[PDB]
Amino acid sequence: GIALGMIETRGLVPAIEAADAMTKAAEVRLIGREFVGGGYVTVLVRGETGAVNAAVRAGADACERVGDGLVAAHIIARPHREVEPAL
Template identity: 45%
Template sequence: MNAIGLIEITGLVAAIEALDAMLKAADVEFLTWEKRLGGRLVTVIVKGEVSAVQEAISTGKVRADEITRAVAWAVIPSPHPETMRMISISASKISNNRLGGINEF
């Protein structure tokens, strides 16, 4: 992993659509997500090579803007270990609440 990408989107449905488009467009891995304001703002975080993350964020922004809008986005090459620690804390919160059978599609 050389980079992380973050995109904040208005609305959960748009965020899921954007994440799906991101994962299909580039060789990136989904790390975690955060929702705020009751799901009105959703941040999706992916990781991968810098160019793949840039492509994923660009694709996710276009898809989100087709539905609602992307509020903010960033690509962070070579993130600091403390940045990754913060993201892993977020990921651990949701990993304890994952739904069984979600990968059965």
């Protein structure tokens, strides 16, 4: 799967709890963990469209009340080729 699911949060613990929840909800490959800066931490996974959608939804409603909580959670159906150097 090539669909990309990405989560923003305030600190690594909400990030990794969300990541565990979404990986358990659907088997996706955790592509990256990036320190955005200023407390923003992001997690990047790739997989099938429905699986990644369900995983992102599960991480979203599972990590809302951890620490400061979620910041941004949206889905991309068909990530485009030139985004790979950004991934």
